[PDB]
């Protein structure tokens, strides 16, 4: 199955209220495995998954230094972006940075990406071919130019096609137990009502890995993505995920309603109705 | 393993 490693970085200006916040996290698939909090007392890159714990001091000392050198840059970049957009220092703004590599089931490189965003909006993005840049506005053009002068795209291409996948492959076989599993969902359905006009049919899918899952209702083949109360796939906390999809249905018409579950751990896509 | 640089905006 496909696997991917992603690094997420957030910095927000807190004017007159101490240092800018800076949070970094590392995921493999949907499993976090490292963190660095600028406010944390340790000032260290720390492990957040059992299989990353065996990495030696080399690793923690080295990453620790890189992530600090990151925060130092982002502290400045907040200043720089206020200048591009001519903004006062009284407000709080948000820099976001995500990069990572996607590999297929043969653990071969598929896709690299590395994207920035200011105040929730897409700011600048590395392309699919890992050479050009997408720069949204005036301000990002000023960043793009500096990143062509400083041959940044080429630095990233070498990381994504090289060291990124090289270490995703490490993390996978080290956390083979965790990352290469597919726990399939335990599925049940609840029927509950308050009035007589209608009852609500809810379709559950619990403790399953990875988070990718599809839940859809129907009235004999027709997509009932209508009264389709659908909650975001959420974490259980034990490394698995949860999701349910609900419909409210006129009484006594639970026969025609069925819920389709589709997941990587299910041989046949699993169907169920109320009993 | 991180990308070692944070390039300046």
């Amino acid at each position, epitope marked *: 199955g496909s696997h991917s490693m992603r690094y997420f970085f957030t910095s927000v200006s807190r004017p007159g209220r101490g240092e800018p916040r800076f949070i970094a996290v590392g995921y493999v698939d949907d499993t976090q495995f490292v963190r660095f909090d600028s406010d944390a007392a340790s000032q260290r890159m720390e492990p957040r998954a059992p299989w990353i714990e065996q*990495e*030696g*001091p*080399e*690793y923690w000392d*080295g990453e620790t*230094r*890189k992530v600090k*050198a990151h925060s130092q840059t982002h502290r400045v970049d907040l200043g720089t972006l206020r200048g591009y957009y001519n903004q006062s220092e009284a407000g709080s703004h948000t820099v976001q940075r995500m990069y990572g590599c996607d590999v297929g089931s043969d*653990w*071969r*490189f598929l896709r690299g990406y590395h994207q920035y965003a200011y105040d929730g909006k897409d700011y600048i993005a590395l392309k699919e071919d890992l050479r050009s840049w997408t720069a949204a506005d005036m301000a990002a053009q000023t960043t793009k130019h500096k990143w062509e002068a400083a041959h940044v795209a080429e*630095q990233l291409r*070498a*990381y994504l*096609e*090289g*060291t990124c*996948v*090289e*270490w995703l*492959r*490490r993390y996978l076989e080290n956390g083979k137990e965790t990352l290469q599993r597919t726990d399939a969902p335990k599925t049940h359905m609840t029927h509950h009502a308050v009035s007589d006009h209608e009852a609500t049919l809810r379709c559950w899918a619990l403790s399953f890995y990875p988070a990718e899952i599809t839940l859809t209702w129907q009235r004999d083949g027709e997509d009932q993505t209508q009264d389709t109360e659908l909650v975001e796939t959420r974490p259980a906390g034990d490394g698995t995920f949860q999701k349910w999809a609900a419909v409210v249905v006129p009484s006594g018409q639970e026969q025609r309603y069925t819920c389709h579950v589709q997941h990587e751990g299910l041989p046949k896509p699993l169907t169920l109705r109320w009993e | *393993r991180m990308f*070692p*640089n944070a390039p300046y905006l």
Partner: antibody
Amino acid sequence: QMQLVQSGAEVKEPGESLRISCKGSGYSFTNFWISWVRQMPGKGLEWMGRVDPGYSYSTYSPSFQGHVTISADKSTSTAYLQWNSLKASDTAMYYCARVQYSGYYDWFDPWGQGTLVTVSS
Amino acid sequence: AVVTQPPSASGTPGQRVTISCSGSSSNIGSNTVNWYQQVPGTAPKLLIYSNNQRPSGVPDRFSGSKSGTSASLAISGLQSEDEADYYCAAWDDSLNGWVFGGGTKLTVLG
């Protein structure tokens, strides 16, 4: 007793092509990269490039990108350092060495014995 | 290279000599250092790995460290057999490649 055995010494004319070899043994060949180090006569060590034989991905130092090609053969546990056009200044000793990562471990735990290359009109 | 080693080091049998190895934030700064020994006429050997560890076949008189952008190899109690070229080497982030220092030729003055 993991080991790296390199091809025999070579003397060549400029413009000829040449592919020296580095065969491994005593370890899982695909789990480790092979790199490739130059030592000009009288001078010190320079990293040339590497190949990850597991996935055939292969990189080079900027000095050597485009002057050589570094491939491998998973089955025969062989890595290669290859020229198309030799210079007179390619005359040097060429070591191969087995390394596992670019990190962070890192380090060239076993080295080959060295292949001497001579180039002269 | 952007990592620098003094070409010469000297000591009488039994003395201690450090060998400085001086780089930058991108090589020795954020990545690990390893040391290799080359008795002339031979391929080089892994001497210190992970900044400061010793392979099985290396005696404890050799010892390495690493602070900031500088790493030092310490040979504590020299012997005849120790006169060789000594090379530090760190991955450089700007080059996506390793860089060796120019080497340090060590002499024993018997």
